[PDB]
């Protein structure tokens, strides 16, 4: 499809964000509105690699 929900979403994100990890990196930030904002769009609407990449950490 064009959407991702549940564990397939989580597995896809883990693979996409490699060793960097999630931007939303702590239990408390995974419950955040910003996190949910991205997740609700992927699941309910459309999810693409660009949207997914916004979910990743951005270390130097």
């Amino acid at each position, epitope marked *: 499809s064009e959407t991702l*929900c*549940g*564990g*397939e*979403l*989580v597995d896809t994100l883990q693979f996409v964000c490699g060793d960097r990890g999630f931007y939303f990196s702590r239990p408390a930030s995974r419950v955040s509105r910003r996190s949910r904002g991205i*997740v*609700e769009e992927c699941c*309910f609407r459309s999810c693409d690699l660009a949207l997914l990449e916004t979910y990743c950490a951005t270390p130097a």
Partner: antibody
Amino acid sequence: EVQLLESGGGLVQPGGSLRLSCAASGFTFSNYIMWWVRQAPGKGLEWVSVISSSGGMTRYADSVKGRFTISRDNSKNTLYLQMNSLRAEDTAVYYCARDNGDYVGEKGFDIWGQGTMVTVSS
Amino acid sequence: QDIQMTQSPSSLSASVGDRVTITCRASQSISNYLNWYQQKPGKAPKLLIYTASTLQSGVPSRFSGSASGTDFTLTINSLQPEDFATYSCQQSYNSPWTFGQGTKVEIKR
């Protein structure tokens, strides 16, 4: 005491309309993605509908698309399922349920309504 | 294409204090995203276990879950009389977050 208290089930003729309500208490309702799940007589549980936490996005099982509408009113701490063009095969116990996780359904549904029966019959 | 869930056995009868083993299979790969619910007759299900082995809070330690290759098992160590219920698995990988049909556990007293 976290609680989902459902109301609104009953008897309705084929082609008819019913609206279920699920009133939440003991938690911050607006943080949670909410679910409708049904159980038809001698069948398994099945997803009906899901709504995001704000309410602005929704998703439906194929069997109900175009006919049911889920919504929520965060101000009143309540979840709704509007059931139209009701068919006999929609007869079931209807549960509301809260999302246990963060990625829409990835850790199951932790908190459940008590169930409300919906009978579609002449 | 929608993932189908299969349990074994569909029912069992076991004695208080026994170890009970219930299997769930997915027809496609669900990673480790498998939940267990306990449903007593005419009641809302109760979440026991999510992500194959994570016990939900308030749930007795006698309930445990395992991935078992490409199988999943719920274990009830020390079956109790309260445990009489249907135990159902649910894949949490994708839509439609499909529930299995359940395994009826009877207490052999």
